């Protein structure tokens, strides 16, 4: 997986990536901040409509999925898999609220990569 280009986690200035959250923190406190982006080298799935997504702290990480699909507005033939922290969620038994505080970093922003491959590793 020899990476070449920086990651939204690295590239974007942490402090800047932390502040951006502040807003959502002072605006959407009852929401879990996440950063969904195309996998480094993703040519399948289209470029998400947005990068920032406000997930409800009253659902399961799964929802976010059913939510993404809507965004990507893919067909029942298209394959889409949101990788949380770079790892699929084959097992979604945790709330986006926890999955966040269980993954997200001090920054306070989740980082997930979506693509048409959940077993590319």
């Amino acid at each position: 997986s020899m990476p070449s280009e920086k990651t939204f986690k690295q590239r974007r200035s942490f402090e800047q990536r932390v502040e951006d959250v502040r807003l959502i923190r002072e605006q959407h406190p009852t929401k879990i901040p996440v950063i969904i982006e195309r996998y480094k080298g993703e040519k399948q799935l289209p470029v998400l409509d947005k990068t920032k997504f406000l997930v409800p702290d009253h659902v399961n990480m799964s929802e976010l999925i059913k939510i993404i699909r809507r965004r990507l507005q893919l067909n029942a033939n298209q394959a889409f898999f949101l990788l949380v922290n770079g790892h699929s969620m084959v097992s979604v038994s945790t709330p986006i609220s926890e999955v966040y505080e269980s993954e997200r970093d001090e920054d306070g922003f989740l980082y997930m990569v979506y693509a048409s491959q959940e077993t590319f590793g």
Binding site: D20, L23, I24, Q27, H28, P33, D49, K50, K52, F53, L54, V55, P56, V59, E63, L64, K66, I67, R69, R70, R71
Partner: peptide
């Protein structure tokens, strides 16, 4: 308007299939 990060996207499970 995208002249700032006023409000990100809304993840509503009501607009889902």
């Amino acid at each position: 308007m995208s002249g700032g990060d006023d409000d990100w996207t809304h993840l509503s499970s009501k607009e889902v299939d």
